[PDB]
Amino acid sequence: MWFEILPGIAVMAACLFIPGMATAHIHKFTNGGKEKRVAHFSYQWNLMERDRCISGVNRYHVTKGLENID
């Protein structure tokens, strides 16, 4: 009758489930649908800073293409 254990870990699974999408969704929520732009090196940080400056809204994940330029 091992299935009696099945509820026991099921909520446990749900307990470990929530940290999965919650971090995943909020990132997607915060960065304009895009996932978080990880800056593991100073070049990435410089790219993020230039994107933030170009956006004009102090939001790096806001991105504008050629329609923004002449």
Partner 1 sequence: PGIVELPTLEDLKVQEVKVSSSVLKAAAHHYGAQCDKPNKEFMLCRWEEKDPRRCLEEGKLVNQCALDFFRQIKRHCAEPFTEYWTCIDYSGLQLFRHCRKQQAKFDECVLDKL
Partner 2 sequence: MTMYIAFILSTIFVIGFVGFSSKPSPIYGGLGLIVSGGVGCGIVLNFGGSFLGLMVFLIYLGGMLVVFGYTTAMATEMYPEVWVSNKTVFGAFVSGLMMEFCMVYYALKEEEVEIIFKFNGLGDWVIYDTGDSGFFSEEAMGIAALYSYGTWLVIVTGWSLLIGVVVIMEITRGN
Partner 3 sequence: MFMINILSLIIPILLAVAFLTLVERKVLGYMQLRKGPNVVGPYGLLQPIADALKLVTKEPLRPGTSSISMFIIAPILGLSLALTMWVPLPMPYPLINMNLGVLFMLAMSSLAVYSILWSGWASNSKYALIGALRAVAQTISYEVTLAIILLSVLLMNGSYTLSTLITTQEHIWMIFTSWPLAMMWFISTLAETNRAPFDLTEGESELVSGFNVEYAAGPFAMFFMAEYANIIMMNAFTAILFLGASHDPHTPELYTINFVLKTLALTITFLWIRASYPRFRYDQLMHLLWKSFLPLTLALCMWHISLPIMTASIPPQS
Closest approach of Cβ 26 to partner 3, in Å? 5
Query: Which residue carries 């915060």 as its tokens?
Result: 30
- 10-69: which residues touch partner 1 (CB under 8 A)? 33-38, 47-48, 50-51, 54-55, 63-66, 68-69
Mark out the alpha helices in the chain (DSSP H runs). 5-30, 42-55
The yes or no reply on residue 23 touching partner 3 (CB under 8 A) is: yes
Contact yes or no for 25/48 (Cβ under 8 A):
no
- State how far the Cα of 7 lies from the Cα of 63, in Å rounded to an integer: 46
Residues that bind partner 3 (CB under 8 A): 1-2, 4-5, 7-9, 11-13, 15-30, 35-36, 38-41
